[model samples]
Structure formats: C-alpha cells, structure tokens
Target: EFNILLATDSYKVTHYKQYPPNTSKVYSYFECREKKKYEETVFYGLQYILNKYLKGKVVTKEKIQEAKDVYKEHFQDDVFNEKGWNYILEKYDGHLPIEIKAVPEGFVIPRGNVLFTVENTDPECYWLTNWIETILVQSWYPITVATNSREQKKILAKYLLETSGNLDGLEYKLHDFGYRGVSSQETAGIGASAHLVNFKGTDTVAGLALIKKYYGTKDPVPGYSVPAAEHSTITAWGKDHEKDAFEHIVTQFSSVPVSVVSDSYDIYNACEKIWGEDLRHLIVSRSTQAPLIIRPDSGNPLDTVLKVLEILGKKFPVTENSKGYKLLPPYLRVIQGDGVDINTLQEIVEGMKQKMWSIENIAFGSGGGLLQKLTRDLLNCSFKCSYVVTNGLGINVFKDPVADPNKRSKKGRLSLHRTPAGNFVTLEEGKGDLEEYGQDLLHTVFKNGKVTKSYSFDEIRKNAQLNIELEA
Candidate 1:
C-alpha cells in the first residue's frame, strides 16, 4: 500500500514519496552515494538551473497540466494519479513548496558526499517538486568535464613549471574546440562553463551568453577565443594558392592573436617554406602586435608538433627558460587540435617534457573529447531520498541493494557540513544541532520557488580553484 508514484523508477522518481501519506513534512537529500569511486568528477553545473529552472519560476496550471498530460500519455495502464500534482498546482498556485540547500557551485564534493538537499516546506506538498530530481542531479557530466579540465591543468602546470620555470601561458594551454562536437548548443554551453571553471580559453562562444544569463557575467565574456581558420576557409583558397591563404589570414587578423589551420596541404611545407621562410620577416615584425597561433589539424599530433617545432626553431629566435627547456619565440606557438582526449593530451604533454621542449610552446584543442565523450557513468551521479516525515514522525529511509553493497544510500534527514577535520561530511538529521556543528556546507540556495543565493561566473571560477581539493 506504500512506495508508488507516477515518476519513472529509472531516476528514482517513481518512489519519490511513499503512498498512504499521513505526514506533515518530507526531506529528501541528494548525494553521489559513492564519490570516492569516481575520481575525476568535479562539482559544477548545479547552479545553472538552481536560479532559473528549479527555483526562479512558478509552475503554473498550464505547466502542471503539461506534466499531467505527459504522465498520463506516457505511463500505461492508467496507473498514474493526477491528484497529487493538481494538489500542488491548486495549493501553492503552481509554484513548488520546497526549499533547496546545497554547496556552492564549483565546490568539490567527494564520493558519498552530499551536494544538495530538497525538502517540501509543507508536509502536504511532499511530491510537488520530486519530478525535478532528473534535471537537478543530471549535473554529473558538467562536473566531470570541469574536474577533468582542472586535472588537465594540473598536468599542464607541472610541465609548465618544470620546463618554462613559470606558469605564464598555462591559462591558454587547453582551448575548447567542442562547439560543433556536442549534441546540442545547450551541452556546448554547459560544458564550456564547466571547462571555464578551470581555464579561460574557449571557442564555445555560446558559453559566454550562458554565463552572462545564468552567472550574472557582463561584458568581455567569461571565456575567450582568437580569430581562427577552419578547413573550409583555408581550403577555399584552392590547392596551389596555400601561401596566399596563409598570407590572407595573417594580414586579416594581424592586429590580434589568431590561429590558422596549416595542414590542409603539406603541413610541413606550410610551416617550413611558407611561414618560417617566406613570412619570417613579416611574422617577426608583427611579434609585438599579437602572436600567431599555428594549428595543425591532421596527422599524429605527437609527430607533427615535434616536426613543426624543429622547422620553426630553425628560422625563429629560440630561447631557453630557467629550467633549460627550449621555448618558441614570443611571436609563434603550436596548437594540436585533432584527436586530443584526456589520455592523449597527457601523453602529448609528457612527450614534450621528454623532448625538453617548453610546455608553453604548444596548446591543445579538444572537440568530442571535451564535450560529447562522457556519460552518466563517468561520475556515477545519482539522486535519492534519505529521509521521510509522515504522520508527524520522521523516518530514516534508505536502500541497501543486496546485489551491490556500494549501492547503499544514506539514511535519515541529513546535514552536510565540514567536519572538525576539515573534510565535508554528512551528519544525521538531528546530529547535535546544525548551528553548533560549526559552518554548514549546504546553505539554503532556494526556497519556495525563488532563488535565495546568486553567484557570479568569476566567483564560481575562483571557488573551483580555491575550494576544490583534487585527488592525488
């Protein structure tokens, strides 16, 4: 007679609220359940919707009807009920009667650590916003990407510090080339935002608009890109006129930093004869203006990058950093944009270190590798209810799957706060008074269908770097 709802069981939504309810309050906390298992999952993307999708707007009768129609049409056997949803629509005027508290976005959360909690303010409206669990907990991918980017930076930082003797060009080391590789503009924007949490280099222009609208960013955008050439633009010049194509782009965006794909035809010749020899004087003369970013879009990045470096080093003025690694002249750099995933990027960086080349000599661009390559399993992200209050009694709810002990969820109403040891930990519902437990990590970000806290893009970026403790 209990444990049933219209939401899909796939997302733990079907069992959102136990049936035959006689309670006045219900608190459901969402956690990773086992975070230590997924090492590279960073915490991000939850704030994007907290303000707009989750807490900003009222549901309205029309929206509730839409959800009702979706449930009735999609769920077979007429087993789904509409009264619970209608009760919310009528009682709260279609606005969710819930309060959500969470760690600030970009803060790193460990496995089994709590990221957010959702509870119905009014016991009668327990099921009012349970359907949002799907969208809320779907932040895993973005968090993973952000964490990966941060990790990538760490790898880049080591080589940069070792070879360049400083971290001067670290920010632009990994560029976002995933705009066209994602399933939708939304993914690109979200992924870019996550990447931006670690680095400022990006070609996903949509991310800027998203940051502006969601993160309260204005002017100059959170991410930056340079004027760059694509295959179409370079190939439009025909086969024999490759030099002319190079000349055009250099002169076109000459006043600012720009990238040109040099591999459409003999990539080596493009660097050796055309750029190194023919345009040597022109490039050197423009050194103080803006550096020219040379992009090789084909062939083995490992092989091509070294070859380009050898050719450019001959004509250009090469220098050695304090650490005795070779660096390209200020006016030139190499970008490998083909087939670079996390493993490959690390491989290339390590290779550069072995060759004694400055980590600042080259950067990376990733498309599919950055945005579309991950799935939910990458972080093992999940959302579940850990407590229930019914008939004026609070109950500790949990699931201990016999199939896998790791699938066991937490129990009872929870409070996530930093322990005296400094690591984040979840406390039992009434574990020694929340206020007395020192500063709680999960602060109220939303209440009664309105966002209670707002964070800026820069603020989150800073938090990602300062607060997130990366795995060793």
Candidate 2:
C-alpha cells in the first residue's frame, strides 16, 4: 500500500493512495519458485525508507514508508522503476513525472529545431512516457546521424560508381557495430539509425525494439535476420573464435553475400587465417555466388589491410596470386567497426589516397557516439514539451527554446511533412490543422491501448533505411 503527493497543475495533489499489484513480465507458466522471484523482485521495489518532509500525523515518515511498501510491491521490476526507490524516496528527490510531446519517431525535421516536449502532468504526466527515452534518443539521434551518414554514403558511392563503372559499383556495406562503441545507448540507436539511412543496410545488434518504436515496423525485418532487399553484419575473426564460424555463416546465408569479421582477436593473423587453404576454397567458392563483405574491427584498419596484402603476397602467395579478402577489391569493400570518431572517419579517403586501401575498400559502421558525438551542445538535442494541462482548457502548447542554435525546437504541436516544393518542413506550429499547406505527420498510430499500425521488422527497417538516404 502507498500514498503519494503528486505535483499537478502547479499544485501538489496530496495523499493519493495505491495498492501494489502482483504482476510480472516473466512467464506465467512458471512454477511456484520462479513466480516467487518475480514477487520478491516487485517487493524489493516497494521497500524503502520514508523521506520525512514534515514530522507530523498529517505529513510524516510513517506515511512515506507505507507508500514505499506499495510501490515496491507493485513496480519492483517495473519498466517504470528506472529510478531506484532509494533516490525517489529521498527527502531531496526532485523528480518531475513528465509527458513528452514531439514529432513521433521517423518524422523528419530541420537542423536547428526542437523535436519534442516534456510536461510533468494527462495526456499530462505519462506514467511510462519518459521510460520511452531509450528508444526516443535512439530514435531521434539516428535521424540526424543517419541524415549525415547518408550524405557521406551517397557521396562516396556515387563517386565510386562513376569511377568503377556500374558493374563494379561500389557495394554499400554498412553496419551498426556501435552498440558497444556509442557513448551511451542514445548514441547506439542514433548511429544505427544513421547507418540504415546511408547505406543499403546495417548489421545492428540492439535494433529490434527501436526499429518498431521509431519506424512502426515489426522486429527481425527481412534482410536483417531473414532476407530482404539486402543484408549485412560484422564479426570479429580474432575474438578467440576461428575463421570456421565465418565459413559456417557464409554457408548458411549463401542466399546473400555475408560480411566477414576480419579483426577477430588478431587483425593481421586473422587476415591470413581467413584465407587459410581450407577457407580460401570457401572464399573463392562463395565470391562467385555471394559477395563476402570482410570487416576489420581494430586499428588503422585500412592501412592494416594494405599492409596485410603486402605480406600475404610475398609469404603465402595463394590468395595473392588468385584471390584476396575483398568480395571485389577496390569496390565491394570490407566494413570497419571501430572507435570511428569523426577524425578517424575523416581520414578514410585521405588515408586511402595513400594507397592505404582504395577509398572503396573502406566502408563504415557508426555507433551512437557518432550522432550524439555532440553533447546537448553538439547535436543540439533535448526533450521539450509540446502540450500542457496547466490550464482549465483540456490541452495547450508551449515550445521550449533550443539550448543552442543547432538545437532549436518548435513550439506547440507539430504538423510535419515535405512541402510541395520538395523539402522536409514542419507546418506552422500552434495550428491544429494545416489549412495552407500540410500533411498530418503522426497518424492515429495507437488506439484503445492497442497499436493500429502494424508492419514487419523489414518494413520498418526499410523505412528507416530510406530516411537515411533521403537525409543526404
């Protein structure tokens, strides 16, 4: 059981009582003991020390304790239990339950603009609204990063197509290996978002949820786990695993050319190991059928590949005389996933100019660190409110100012769309309907606590994929 002092309409709504519910996301088919872990987990969330705001029967520690017990019981493993009760129950806790308003995920906006809002109270304080921030940042940051990456992908791919000719068109192989590299998850999702936008596809690891949450598609879209327009993933050859895993993956995905992880635990050694006598047969056998997108996950990768070739030519000579690691060298390239900050990526073409590796041999797989590479200062990203219930009126709008010029946000509900002139634009804010020129950006996506929009993971993946290229 618990009582709460909720802040509402600038007034504290005091003494709201709630009894914790007995529910869990774990399987219901669980026997007694597993169920007990679930119950105990919820109880753990409920137990807490009371924050003594005032020492009296009207407002005191006893009341706080009772409420803590209830919450611990109800929301222990709660998707909403992000803030440990230790902090939420502190006398100095300053949490403000908020309702965020922004262009829903996947909608396009400008460089200097506010994307959404965070209002603390109905349609106000969304109990689980802020909880969606993981995918939100993941969702939002990618739009920008993807937009940027798409531009780069297109620029390089276009340049390659002209130089290499269509038959040797530089295959656009990209991956989101940044799940681990991104400064935070916000970056991981954003970087993945950007990758999908720029290249034909990505090898994203933490993409299932954001795929749907952002683009409103199902999970494991075709091409990703199954098959679609294209598919791509990166693996580490040197990570204590043998090149045999690469052989197996290629055999299984023979329908599609598989991307190989070159920098297993040893970048140089794995390069040779992959082309081992047994494996070289597999590489040559597969190249004609499905192209192999070899990837280097460690150190000066482009230079390493060039250096590897120099050594392989004199020493082994088998692959050097006939085949090499590339699907089609100088065009269909090896994807690299590393600490790819701006400086490293910027050096791609320059280093390639050094015969380090043909610019075409070097492809990219960014993480969130690329997008959020900017702090609140750089990407100019923030959470702002678009709707408010602080008034007697059912709903109103207030757009917060950007933290900086690159981060400007819009005021009021956004009507997003591409203008007849053919550029993405946000309809005049504060207007309910765009009588002049408009498209209602977000449709009635969810209804009656159920989602009306249904799409496969591949559909959403492609949707995001398109956004990336278009951003270019």
lDDT score, candidate 2: 0.40
lDDT of 2 by residue, 158-268 (tens): 434433333132334444555555576644544564455334355554544454454433334411422211122323333444665666676777656666665545756
Query: Can you tell me which runs of candidate 1 are displaced by over 4 Å?
Result: 1-20, 33-41, 432-436, 466-472
lDDT of 1 by residue, 1-472 (tens): 1112332343333443455458666566666556332443467777787755655335455655565666666654343446665676677665667898888877767777777888888766776446567667667778878877887877788877778666776788899999999999888889988898888899899888788888856456777877989888888989988888889888998889888899998899989999989887768867544889899988887887888888889978999888888988888888999999888888888888888888888999998998889877666677777777767777888888898888788788677777778777778756736476676678888887778887787777767762212321
Measured against the true structure, the TM-scores of the candidates, in listed sequence, are 0.90, 0.52
Off by over 4 Å in 2: 1-107, 113-152, 166-172, 179-286, 290-298, 309-335, 341-343, 353-378, 386-409, 412-414, 417-420, 427-434, 446-472
After aligning candidate 1 to the native by TM-score, how far in Å is the CA of 385 from where it should be?
1.2
Give RMSD (Å) of candidate 1 vs. truth.
Answer: 4.0
- The alpha-carbon lDDT assigned to residue 82 of candidate 2 equals 23
The 10-residue segment with the lowest total lDDT in model 1: 1-10
Candidate lDDT values, in order: 0.76, 0.40
